[PDB]
Design a protein around this nucleic acid. Structure first.
Ligand SMILES: Nc1nc2c(ncn2[C@@H]2O[C@H](COP(=O)(O)O)[C@@H](O)[C@H]2O)c(=O)[nH]1
Ligand SMILES: [Mg+2]
Ligand SMILES: [Mg+2]
Ligand SMILES: [Mg+2]
Ligand SMILES: [Mg+2]
Ligand SMILES: [Mg+2]
Ligand SMILES: [Mg+2]
Ligand SMILES: [Mg+2]
Ligand SMILES: [Mg+2]
Ligand SMILES: [Mg+2]
Ligand SMILES: [Mg+2]
Ligand SMILES: [Mg+2]
Ligand SMILES: [Mg+2]
Ligand SMILES: [Mg+2]
Ligand SMILES: [Mg+2]
Ligand SMILES: [Mg+2]
Ligand SMILES: [Mg+2]
Ligand SMILES: [Mg+2]
Ligand SMILES: [Mg+2]
Ligand SMILES: [Mg+2]
Ligand SMILES: [Mg+2]
Ligand SMILES: [Mg+2]
Ligand SMILES: [Mg+2]
Ligand SMILES: [Mg+2]
Ligand SMILES: [Mg+2]
Ligand SMILES: [Mg+2]
Ligand SMILES: [Mg+2]
Ligand SMILES: [Mg+2]
Ligand SMILES: [Mg+2]
Ligand SMILES: [Mg+2]
Ligand SMILES: [Mg+2]
Ligand SMILES: [Mg+2]
Ligand SMILES: [Mg+2]
Ligand SMILES: [Mg+2]
Ligand SMILES: [Mg+2]
Ligand SMILES: [Mg+2]
Ligand SMILES: [Mg+2]
Ligand SMILES: [Mg+2]
Ligand SMILES: [Mg+2]
Ligand SMILES: [Mg+2]
Ligand SMILES: [Mg+2]
Ligand SMILES: [Mg+2]
Ligand SMILES: [Mg+2]
Ligand SMILES: [Mg+2]
Ligand SMILES: [Mg+2]
Ligand SMILES: [Mg+2]
Ligand SMILES: [Mg+2]
Ligand SMILES: [Mg+2]
Ligand SMILES: [Mg+2]
Ligand SMILES: [Mg+2]
Ligand SMILES: [Mg+2]
Ligand SMILES: [Mg+2]
Ligand SMILES: [Mg+2]
Ligand SMILES: [Mg+2]
Ligand SMILES: [Mg+2]
Ligand SMILES: [Mg+2]
Ligand SMILES: [Mg+2]
Ligand SMILES: [Mg+2]
Ligand SMILES: [Mg+2]
Ligand SMILES: [Mg+2]
Ligand SMILES: [Mg+2]
Ligand SMILES: [Mg+2]
Ligand SMILES: [Mg+2]
Ligand SMILES: [Mg+2]
Ligand SMILES: [Mg+2]
Ligand SMILES: [Mg+2]
Ligand SMILES: [Mg+2]
Ligand SMILES: [Mg+2]
Ligand SMILES: [Mg+2]
Ligand SMILES: [Mg+2]
Ligand SMILES: [Mg+2]
Ligand SMILES: [Mg+2]
Ligand SMILES: [Mg+2]
Ligand SMILES: [Mg+2]
Ligand SMILES: [Mg+2]
Ligand SMILES: [Mg+2]
Ligand SMILES: [Mg+2]
Ligand SMILES: [Mg+2]
Ligand SMILES: [Mg+2]
Ligand SMILES: [Mg+2]
Ligand SMILES: [Mg+2]
Ligand SMILES: [Mg+2]
Ligand SMILES: [Mg+2]
Ligand SMILES: [Mg+2]
Ligand SMILES: [Mg+2]
Ligand SMILES: [Mg+2]
Ligand SMILES: [Mg+2]
Ligand SMILES: [Mg+2]
Ligand SMILES: [Mg+2]
Ligand SMILES: [Mg+2]
Ligand SMILES: [Mg+2]
Ligand SMILES: [Mg+2]
Ligand SMILES: [Mg+2]
Ligand SMILES: [Mg+2]
Ligand SMILES: [Mg+2]
Ligand SMILES: [Mg+2]
Ligand SMILES: [Mg+2]
Ligand SMILES: [Mg+2]
Ligand SMILES: [Mg+2]
Ligand SMILES: [Mg+2]
Ligand SMILES: [Mg+2]
Ligand SMILES: [Mg+2]
Ligand SMILES: [Mg+2]
Ligand SMILES: [Mg+2]
Ligand SMILES: [Mg+2]
Ligand SMILES: [Mg+2]
Ligand SMILES: [Mg+2]
Ligand SMILES: [Mg+2]
Ligand SMILES: [Mg+2]
Ligand SMILES: [Mg+2]
Ligand SMILES: [Mg+2]
Ligand SMILES: [Mg+2]
Ligand SMILES: [Mg+2]
Ligand SMILES: [Mg+2]
Ligand SMILES: [Mg+2]
Ligand SMILES: [Mg+2]
Ligand SMILES: [Mg+2]
Ligand SMILES: [Mg+2]
Ligand SMILES: [Mg+2]
Ligand SMILES: [Mg+2]
Ligand SMILES: [Mg+2]
Ligand SMILES: [Mg+2]
Ligand SMILES: [Mg+2]
Ligand SMILES: [Mg+2]
Ligand SMILES: [Mg+2]
Ligand SMILES: [Mg+2]
Ligand SMILES: [Mg+2]
Ligand SMILES: [Mg+2]
Ligand SMILES: [Mg+2]
Ligand SMILES: [Mg+2]
Ligand SMILES: [Mg+2]
Ligand SMILES: [Mg+2]
Ligand SMILES: [Zn+2]
Lengths: 61, 153, 110
RNA sequence: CGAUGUUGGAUCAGGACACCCAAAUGGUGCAACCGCUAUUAAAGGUUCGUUUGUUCAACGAUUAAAGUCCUACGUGAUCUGAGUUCAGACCGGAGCAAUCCAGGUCGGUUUCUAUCUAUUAUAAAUUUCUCCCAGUACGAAAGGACAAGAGAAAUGGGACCAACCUCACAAACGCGUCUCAGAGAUAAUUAAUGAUUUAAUCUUAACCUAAUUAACUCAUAAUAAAUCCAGCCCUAGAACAGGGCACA
RNA sequence: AACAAACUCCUAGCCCAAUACCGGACUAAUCUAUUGAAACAUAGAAGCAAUAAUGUUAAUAUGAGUAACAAGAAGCCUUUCUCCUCGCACACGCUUACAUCAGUAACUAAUAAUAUACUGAUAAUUAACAACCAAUAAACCAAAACAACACUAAAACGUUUAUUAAUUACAUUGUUAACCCAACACAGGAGUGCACCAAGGAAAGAUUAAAAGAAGUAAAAGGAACUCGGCAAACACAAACCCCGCCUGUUUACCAAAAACAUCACCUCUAGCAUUACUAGUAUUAGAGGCAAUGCCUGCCCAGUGACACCAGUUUAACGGCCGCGGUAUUCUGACCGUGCAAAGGUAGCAUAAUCACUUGUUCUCCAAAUAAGGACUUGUAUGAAUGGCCACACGAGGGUUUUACUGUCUCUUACUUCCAAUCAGUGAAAUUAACCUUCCCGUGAAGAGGCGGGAAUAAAAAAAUAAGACGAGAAGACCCUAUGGAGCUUUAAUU
RNA sequence: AUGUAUUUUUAAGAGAUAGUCUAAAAAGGUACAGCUUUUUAGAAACGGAUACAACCUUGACUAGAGAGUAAAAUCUUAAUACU
RNA sequence: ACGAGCUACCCAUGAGCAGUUUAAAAGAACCAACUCAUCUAUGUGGCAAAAUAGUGAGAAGACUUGUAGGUAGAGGUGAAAA
RNA sequence: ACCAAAGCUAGCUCAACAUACUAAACAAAUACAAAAAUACACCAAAAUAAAAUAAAACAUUCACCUAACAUUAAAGUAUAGGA
């Protein structure tokens, strides 16, 4: 979203990273519980945590 | 889809159509023979047939009284309708009006025109299409058939 | 939408010379046995109808001259006679119109 | 760049299979139900709402399922203009200023009369839910079948007003009513017989084989009697066509 | 083997391709000097040759007989019926378009009939209504609004006295109209006095009643579930919560009516004064400005740049700015301390806001569900106090959110009329057009093919619809870049 | 040396100096491009590679209803027993 | 050089605002004439080079409007929309 | 066969000469709001030419650019020029 004209209209530049927390073995268990407690608003009912990025114009950024 | 429709669209709507038919009926009652467009005369034929039937109900009939009051815009025609047209149409059941297609109007529109006339009027007879005489070849052969059929019984 | 190219005369002729656009010949034309003029088999003769219409116009003009007002319509039957005629017993008691013209051949006493 | 009109939606959707369901199977750490993967199969479907212009996304209720894409990430000479993408104006920041913003807020003209190509209706169904099957098989019990057969519906195709409803025309219409199908054929996968390789082995070895998905064709169903057509009606129709005009 | 070229032989020759640029030989049509006189030769000259400039002018075609336009009915021929109601006159303006007779084959009415709108001839608007229609001094403060008497914004509209005002019929001018300005006999723009008809006119040229479109009416059950939004419509036409502006008002004639401007109020600065503004006024005044009624207030700073002071010094309700680094109470924090720079280090208030991004910040209420709305927490390291900060009544076609009532918005559309539409008659445009005898699939190709290649399809012409394509029509892209091309605006740009 | 006739100066000069692919030597990128930058060579057929710019055959005049040649036209396998 | 007969603002001279609630002619309230143009639908070579229909705001005032005059482009005027 | 096409004329252009240069008509009215016979006034005025262009930009400069001295040479010379 935002003003970019045809560029924003027809360029996929909004990034979203979604991943399950319970089975994420690359994060320590107490850290996983702490994230599940503090960021419960960003976690849906399937346990998948979602983060999104819209600020930068570039998809890689 | 116009299935099962008997009234054609005329004028500016239903009320305007009724008013046009009322004016045509008033003219027909006043003059005993009028001419208009073929569609207008065709639609007016039934109304003129029903007006004579209503007039045959008698003068004292309040329903026919109000019907004539509504339809005959010129009020001097209501006594005419109830004392000339109705009395002279007594033995006839439905042969009150005669409609004939006349040639197209000389104006640039070239409309399909018809003439309607109350039977038994005091006007010159129209050039009605008369059938052939029985002395024709075909009709005489048919008369021979009829004579043979009569002689066979 | 605007046309893409000019249509050639071949296309134009093929379009506007089709039998659908050509005027069809009428085969219901016949001559009137009375006056010999042309008329259609389902349409009244123009000449005879014009005669009848003019006679009706004169008759109506005379019958409206008889009535000096717009709303003065006869309450009885009406009969029209020509010069050299007298009302019969069955024609008396009705409003009468008299014409100086003689009785036409097509108009019957009755 | 002497113009290829640019997101989401409304309508209509065409196609691919790297299949969500529906169908036939293999392996299971498959006893049964839920499951996890693997093969084949695209005739048909793939919901309704709150917030956001939103594609996405979060949530509520369902469903057999709310599939991934291509189609100028379809479709503005069919539509919408909320945002983007002009001119007006604020807030925060930069610049002394004019001004600047992939930083947000309100408001902001969406033209076309179709020249050409193209096109403008034949059918021969699908899927869920209830009763038994049976608390039967399967199991230590909790749990709990498949198949076969009876029905109910829903979607879609084709039709119609006896009644209800819309209905001040005799008609049209849905919210109302009726109907919807047999044979062959196969892909994956099972076994019979049998050599190369005298054992075995379903066979890019033959012979006939049998259990077998969806498609796809065919039975079957519809039209299917040429040269009378002036006028008048029609439940037939833009015009042209088509059906009637002997009962009465 | 064979078949297969601009290659090479054979038979004759006038005996070897081409873009920009260069060279040569001829030549079409004119005028002149000499020949010639059924139209040529030698020479000298040029306004010396057009398949192409969105080329100019004139006529024509396609689109196309297509879009589009009109006259209520009958009748005894201008007499009666059905409907809607912008009519009379004057001022301004147009000039004869007005009236009578005659004609309309054609010219004007966007079509006929005929004629107030075309042609010819002849006449007309007669003043009492209106235009032109005394000066010079003096008495004169006391409003018009039924004006009794009053308010503030202090208000046009008059007589009398005295001096001269030719003096004697009948002067001159505008007097029609269906009309003016809009390219048109245009649904537009038009001042004043009267009444809402006692005066003006006709929505339909004639048929059928297809689709699609516009307008209207009605609707089972539901009652916003449609949509960005309750836009439109509706048997309702109510009550509330926020943001922004106090309020009435003004603005981008022609895409924006607002949260923009102005506004009463509050503050600054600049002026001690006379015959054209300010002003016939004099600091309680008059200009140049900022911000916006009212209520609480407007905290610090002259370090820089301006202005007074012609240097010091004063000014922020002038232009504007109002802090880092590190450790500390018992774990989060830091009341506190050390040190450094400043002109002061952001005070009060409010706060996820119209306030960069993180943001859908966290939490509560509303809903079954909410990135919506409202209330709270709050460093917002980029809030903040007259470029004003906070609340409040009334207010607003401003922008958001709810509660019912309401309904075709929608579930899911349907029926009927009018204008449309199709047929008959009359009149008759436009963008566009290289020529088309103008198919489909795949591949190819200046990288999206009706014209190529390989295959399929293929009697030829109309009429009515739908818009997928002709990278459709319209405007030498307004976005981007270039131009030693412009112009507006601002300055701490360069010459002044 | 040899096989050919070309080369250098004199006097007039304009165009062009905005370029593509193929083969080869390199660099950048991704040992990616119908990519970009340098050097050598070639081409821009009316034949062939179905269509085609650059690939191949071809010292491009005219007439013939003569002939001989050049590049060039369906490219290869689709296979695993060990009692 | 020519343009303020449209429009922006002034200057003279005139004219309009009916009804209703209100001690009120209160920059009050409802709604006419009248003046603007919020929203939508048609129209998009159209009735119209800015319209029609429905619906809206003001409607005793910072209100509309008639006639005559003035301010003219390095400018005029502007309740700033360049 | 319609639509159509072809005339040779009106007249224009460049010069020379030339009297010497605002043609004819002006009965009435004509700068009252022109074609309106007729009343105590005001009448009048001047202050450089600029730029588009060239110098490939543009600031100094840029002939001709509505002012008489003509022709043959000196001569495109001396000079003036961001020289
Ligand atoms: N510079 C240059 N340009 C050429 C040459 N040959 C042809 N051209 C250019 O190529 C274009 C035409 O292509 P061609 O007709 O030669 O195939 C033109 O722009 C022409 O100027 C040449 O030899 N040198
Ligand atoms: Mg947004
Ligand atoms: Mg923006
Ligand atoms: Mg931007
Ligand atoms: Mg992209
Ligand atoms: Mg382009
Ligand atoms: Mg083009
Ligand atoms: Mg183009
Ligand atoms: Mg296109
Ligand atoms: Mg589909
Ligand atoms: Mg598969
Ligand atoms: Mg399945
Ligand atoms: Mg499918
Ligand atoms: Mg596109
Ligand atoms: Mg894309
Ligand atoms: Mg793609
Ligand atoms: Mg698209
Ligand atoms: Mg779109
Ligand atoms: Mg459109
Ligand atoms: Mg399109
Ligand atoms: Mg918008
Ligand atoms: Mg604020
Ligand atoms: Mg912005
Ligand atoms: Mg917006
Ligand atoms: Mg608005
Ligand atoms: Mg068509
Ligand atoms: Mg259309
Ligand atoms: Mg049990
Ligand atoms: Mg079962
Ligand atoms: Mg059904
Ligand atoms: Mg064996
Ligand atoms: Mg076995
Ligand atoms: Mg069959
Ligand atoms: Mg028939
Ligand atoms: Mg050969
Ligand atoms: Mg030879
Ligand atoms: Mg040769
Ligand atoms: Mg010669
Ligand atoms: Mg020439
Ligand atoms: Mg020519
Ligand atoms: Mg040309
Ligand atoms: Mg034509
Ligand atoms: Mg057409
Ligand atoms: Mg039409
Ligand atoms: Mg009419
Ligand atoms: Mg005129
Ligand atoms: Mg005419
Ligand atoms: Mg006349
Ligand atoms: Mg008069
Ligand atoms: Mg009609
Ligand atoms: Mg009509
Ligand atoms: Mg319709
Ligand atoms: Mg409708
Ligand atoms: Mg209704
Ligand atoms: Mg309803
Ligand atoms: Mg909703
Ligand atoms: Mg929805
Ligand atoms: Mg509304
Ligand atoms: Mg409401
Ligand atoms: Mg309400
Ligand atoms: Mg808010
Ligand atoms: Mg306001
Ligand atoms: Mg107040
Ligand atoms: Mg103003
Ligand atoms: Mg305005
Ligand atoms: Mg505007
Ligand atoms: Mg407003
Ligand atoms: Mg507006
Ligand atoms: Mg303000
Ligand atoms: Mg104070
Ligand atoms: Mg304040
Ligand atoms: Mg302060
Ligand atoms: Mg200072
Ligand atoms: Mg100081
Ligand atoms: Mg607070
Ligand atoms: Mg606040
Ligand atoms: Mg608040
Ligand atoms: Mg923010
Ligand atoms: Mg919102
Ligand atoms: Mg909502
Ligand atoms: Mg919220
Ligand atoms: Mg809040
Ligand atoms: Mg700040
Ligand atoms: Mg601020
Ligand atoms: Mg300040
Ligand atoms: Mg302000
Ligand atoms: Mg408002
Ligand atoms: Mg409000
Ligand atoms: Mg207002
Ligand atoms: Mg209905
Ligand atoms: Mg016609
Ligand atoms: Mg053209
Ligand atoms: Mg063809
Ligand atoms: Mg080519
Ligand atoms: Mg091209
Ligand atoms: Mg292709
Ligand atoms: Mg082909
Ligand atoms: Mg071919
Ligand atoms: Mg084939
Ligand atoms: Mg199309
Ligand atoms: Mg083409
Ligand atoms: Mg185009
Ligand atoms: Mg261009
Ligand atoms: Mg543009
Ligand atoms: Mg630009
Ligand atoms: Mg350059
Ligand atoms: Mg320049
Ligand atoms: Mg310049
Ligand atoms: Mg300077
Ligand atoms: Mg050179
Ligand atoms: Mg160059
Ligand atoms: Mg390249
Ligand atoms: Mg080379
Ligand atoms: Mg070829
Ligand atoms: Mg060669
Ligand atoms: Mg003036
Ligand atoms: Mg004026
Ligand atoms: Mg009043
Ligand atoms: Mg008021
Ligand atoms: Mg309106
Ligand atoms: Mg309405
Ligand atoms: Mg109001
Ligand atoms: Mg009000
Ligand atoms: Mg200037
Ligand atoms: Mg100015
Ligand atoms: Mg501004
Ligand atoms: Mg601006
Ligand atoms: Mg220059
Ligand atoms: Mg140059
Ligand atoms: Mg320049
Ligand atoms: Mg000069
Ligand atoms: Mg010097
Ligand atoms: Zn006859």
């Amino acid at each position: 979203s935002g003003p970019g004209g045809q560029n924003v209209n027809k360029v996929n530049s909004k990034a979203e990273v979604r991943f399950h927390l319970a089975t994420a073995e690359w994060i320590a268990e107490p850290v996983r519980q702490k994230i599940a407690i503090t960021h419960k608003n960003k976690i849906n009912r399937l346990g998948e945590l979602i983060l999104t990025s819209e600020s930068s114009r570039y998809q890689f950024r | 889809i116009s299935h099962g429709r008997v009234f054609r669209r005329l004028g500016l709507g239903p009320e305007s159509r009724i008013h046009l038919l009322q004016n045509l009926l008033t003219g027909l009652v006043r003059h005993e023979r009028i001419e208009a467009s073929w569609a207008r005369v065709d639609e007016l034929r039934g109304y003129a047939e029903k007006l004579i039937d209503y007039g045959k109900l008698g003068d004292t009939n309040e329903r026919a009284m109000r019907m004539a009051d509504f339809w005959l815009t010129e009020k001097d025609l209501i006594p005419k309708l109830f004392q000339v047209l109705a009395p002279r149409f007594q033995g006839q059941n439905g042969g009150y009006t005669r409609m004939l297609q006349i040639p197209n109007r000389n104006e640039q529109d070239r409309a399909k025109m018809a003439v309607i006339e109350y039977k038994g009027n005091c006007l010159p007879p129209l050039p009605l299409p008369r059938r052939d005489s029985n002395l024709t070849l075909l009709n005489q052969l048919l008369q021979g058939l009829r004579q043979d059929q009569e002689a066979s019984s | 939408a605007a046309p893409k190219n000019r249509r050639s005369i071949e296309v134009n002729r093929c379009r506007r010379r089709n039998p659908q656009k050509l005027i069809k010949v009428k085969n219901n034309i016949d001559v009137c046995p009375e006056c010999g003029h042309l008329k259609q088999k389902h349409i009244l003769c123009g000449y005879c109808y014009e005669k009848v219409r003019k006679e009706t116009a004169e008759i109506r003009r005379q019958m409206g001259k008889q009535e000096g007002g717009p709303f003065r319509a006869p309450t009885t039957e009406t009969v029209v006679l020509y010069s050299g005629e007298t009302p019969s017993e069955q024609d008396q008691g009705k409003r009468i119109i008299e014409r100086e013209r003689k009785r036409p051949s097509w108009f019957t006493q009755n």
